């Protein structure tokens, strides 16, 4: 079974305001290997995010 | 089984205000590998996100 | 089983404001190896993120 190609030109400029930031929780992702087997068995997200702010954005006074 | 070609030119400029930000929770994603097998068995998302804010956007005084 | 190709030109400029930042929690990711086997069995995320802030963004006087 034939191998494929993945290419990712991820070009990012980030000037954002975030209180709490988490990355992805993807299970199976970017598989160009031919005849390969990926299993994710009973993956669970029970995570808790609590965020409190008075004010968040920019002023530009 | 022939392998495919995946290409992503993700070009992102981010100036946003976000209180709580979480990435994707995709199960199977971008599989160019020919004859490969991807199995996500019983994935569960029970995560809790709580967000509280006084004010969030920009002022531009 | 044929091996594939993965290439990532990650070009990130980051000037953002973040209180709490967590990386990704992806299970299986970027597999160019042909005939390889990846198994993630019962992965669980029980993490607790608590974030409190007075003010978060930029002033730009």
Residue numbers in the entry:
A (entry chain B), B (entry chain C), C (entry chain A): 270 to 330
From the article:
Abundant filamentous inclusions of tau are characteristic of more than 20 neurodegenerative diseases that are collectively termed tauopathies. Six tau isoforms that range from 352 to 441 amino acids in length are expressed in adult human brain from a single gene by alternative mRNA splicing. Tau filaments consist of a structured core made mostly of the repeat domain, with less structured N- and C-terminal regions forming the fuzzy coat. Here, we report in vitro assembly conditions with recombinant tau that replicate the structures of filaments from both Alzheimer’s disease (AD) and chronic traumatic encephalopathy (CTE), as determined by cryo-EM.
We found that reducing the shaking speed from 700 to 200 rpm was important for the formation of filaments with the AD fold by tau (297–391). To show that this was not only the case for tau (297–391), we assembled tau (258–391) and tau (297–394) with a shaking speed of 700 rpm. When assembling tau (258–391) at 700 rpm, we observed protofilaments with partial similarity to the GGT fold. The structures were nearly identical at residues 288–322, with an all-atom r.m.s.d. of 1.5 Å, (filament type 38a). It is possible that the absence of a non-proteinaceous co-factor, which was hypothesised to be present inside the GGT fold, precluded formation of bona fide GGT filaments. Further experiments are needed to identify the co-factor of GGT. With the exception of the reconstruction for filament type 47a, which showed backbone oxygen atoms indicative of a right-handed filament, all reconstructions of filaments with previously unobserved protofilament folds with resolutions beyond 2.9 Å (i.e. filament types 12a, 27a 38a, 40a, 44a, 45a, and 47a) showed backbone oxygen densities indicative of left-handed filaments.
